[PDB]
């Protein structure tokens, strides 16, 4: 018997592979490299737990933030109404509120908390955040703090104690207490909030929705037989109501390899014959009290930068890529800020471009997290055509000529918030 089978052929659409995006709630056909051709899975026992990848159990673990000192003898700062500590509220912490490790010519390493690491894997986020505050005190110390959650604010530009009390806030007493948690609310005009840090070239980035601020209500008191400094260690975890929406390009990478190749097209340097360079002074720049890069000791011998491409943002400062130099500089504390550079020997890590006609000059900045901030702020002041006299306090001082570079110095464009 050999009956014909004239059953009509079906239309089918050939595709080379199965789903690339699906990770749950579906089967995946595949060629298993086993001897057993059925649905096979590795054996288990109590010796081997189940996967501990449940998000809530991960982001519930507290991570450490940048600690700070709280000095009882500071008759200037330790007063009612003083702002001790403040930052925007979002699951990824602000970069400057996290422990860092910098490497010349490499990428910075950030010690992100679990809630920050997980959040960098997803596009959206929402929920309450637990801010645990740990105090290095003993039963002699006493104070009262007011910590507040300000919805719809990203900076402390208009922030005072007498305003902070007009938002959701808590008042903590440091009377024989060393730990307390401030579970802050989630107050937004929408249901999910876009992550702050995204991808290369600030891909898909945005801003934080709210602000947390710690004010001094009743100033810290100590005694003579007791440490006058109380360290405060902030920690962060997800509230029980915390959720993460949508898989995206990780905002982060591992620190096993912190190498990076900056784009060759953005690199700038000094014109030929205008290097090697050294840090020095000249008269037509604040009467030679500020630091600039020179190529010689004859005057008007200030290193000139090569062609600077027009696609480079006007508010951008620069970072040294190749070999660099060390130089001794200082900067006195600027009014209304905690910005100061003590007199010491620093490596050259950042630069800001000072334009004088058809000539472009470079101003040196120290390779330090605060030097990064001051460099950025200066570049912004030059961008708005700020008075030359008002940019003066944001420029490192001239102390003494420093060593010269081996050869030319290469710079790459960068920009911060």
């Amino acid at each position: 018997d050999n009956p014909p089978d004239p059953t009509p052929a079906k239309f089918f659409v050939p595709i080379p592979s199965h789903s690339w995006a699906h990770g749950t709630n579906t089967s995946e056909p595949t060629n298993t490299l086993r001897l057993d051709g059925g649905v096979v899975g590795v054996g288990r026992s109590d010796d081997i737990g189940t996967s501990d990848t449940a998000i809530s159990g991960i982001i519930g673990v507290y991570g450490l933030l940048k600690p700070f000192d709280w000095n009882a003898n500071d008759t200037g700062r330790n007063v009612g109404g003083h702002l001790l500590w403040s930052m925007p509220v979002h699951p990824q912490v602000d970069k400057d509120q996290v422990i860092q490790v910098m490497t010349q010519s490499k990428l910075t390493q950030y010690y992100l908390p679990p809630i920050s690491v997980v959040s960098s894997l997803y596009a959206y986020t929402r929920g309450s955040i637990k801010y645990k505050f740990l105090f290095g005190n003993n039963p002699r110390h006493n104070a009262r703090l007011l910590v507040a959650y300000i919805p719809g604010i990203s900076s402390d530009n208009r922030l005072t104690l007498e305003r902070a009390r007009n938002s959701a806030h808590v008042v903590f007493s440091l009377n024989e207490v060393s730990e307390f948690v401030f579970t802050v609310p989630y107050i937004t005009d929408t249901m999910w909030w876009p992550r702050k840090y995204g991808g290369p070239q600030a891909a898909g980035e945005f801003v934080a929705p709210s602000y947390i601020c710690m004010f001094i209500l009743n100033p810290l008191v100590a005694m003579e037989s007791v440490p006058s400094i109380v360290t405060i260690v902030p920690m962060i975890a997800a509230g029980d109501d915390f959720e993460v929406a949508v898989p995206a390009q990780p905002a982060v990478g591992l620190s096993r390899n912190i190498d990076v190749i900056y784009p060759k097209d953005s690199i700038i340097s000094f014109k030929s014959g205008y290097f090697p360079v050294y840090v020095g002074s000249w008269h037509s720049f604040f009467d030679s009290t500020k630091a600039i890069l020179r190529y010689g000791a004859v005057s008007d011998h200030i290193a000139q930068l090569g062609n600077i491409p027009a696609n480079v943002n006007r508010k951008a400062f620069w970072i040294v890529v190749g070999d660099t130099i060390k130089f001794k500089t200082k900067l006195d504390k600027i009014n209304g800020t905690e910005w100061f550079i003590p007199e010491g020997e620093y490596t050259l890590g950042y630069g800001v471009v000072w334009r004088d006609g058809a000539y472009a000059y470079m101003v040196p900045y120290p390779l330090t997290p605060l030097g990064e901030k001051i460099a950025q702020y200066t570049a912004s002041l030059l961008a708005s055509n700020t008075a030359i006299s008002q940019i003066r306090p944001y420029i490192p001082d001239y102390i003494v000529d420093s060593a010269a570079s081996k050869d030319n110095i290469l710079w790459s464009p960068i920009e911060d918030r």
Binding site: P16, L33, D52, T53, L107, A245, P250, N313
Partner: protein
Amino acid sequence: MERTFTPNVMQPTPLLPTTNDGRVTFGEAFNDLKDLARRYQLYWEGTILEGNLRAIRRNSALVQLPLYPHGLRIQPDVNNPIWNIMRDGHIPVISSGFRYFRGGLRLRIVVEGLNSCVWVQHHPDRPSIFSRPIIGRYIAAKDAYRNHAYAAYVQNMSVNRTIEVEVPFYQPGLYGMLNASDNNTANSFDRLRFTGLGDLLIGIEGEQPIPKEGIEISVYYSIADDFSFNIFCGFPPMVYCDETYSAATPDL
């Protein structure tokens, strides 16, 4: 328990109403990292020319590929734009928070430019002690040629240029180590047989010449269904992707 210890809670408002991990607003839930680790990512990718292979190519291997759940040690260079600015995928980032694992991996080999046949073998008892692949004529004879009795799959590119395989867990111990170091002399045994799933070898089976542009092999990978990220230790410090290529030149 200290890691989740929250004393003296001060909470101004009630909690935020749930969306079931996104299921209310979007149609799906996002509650487990294991689900994301099951979405494929790039494991390794390279171009191979005739000059990279043995002078006389006797159906020899193209790539010797070590299999790590936490991925390979990335090399960011001008030739590899992805690793340079995207850095490590989600799976290596997920893996970094856990010490051990016990499951298999799912691979997808995409071979373009070759009209010949591709063979793939899994060597569970021969895993590499380095976190980088070995290419062409640098592959030792013991691996450069098809071995017998190993679980394998042979695929003609004429029918499909994408190979789909699942690599099993064949290790003598309880766990396999995640995030293992290549500099390991005090515990060579751990690094040798308690770390990687075993090398995966991808070779060519035919006499067809390789085009002057060469062939490109792209290996994607993901976690299998029987896989588990097991003991949660700390996360290591991270780098930020927005600090590779700056937004100072928003288009580049």
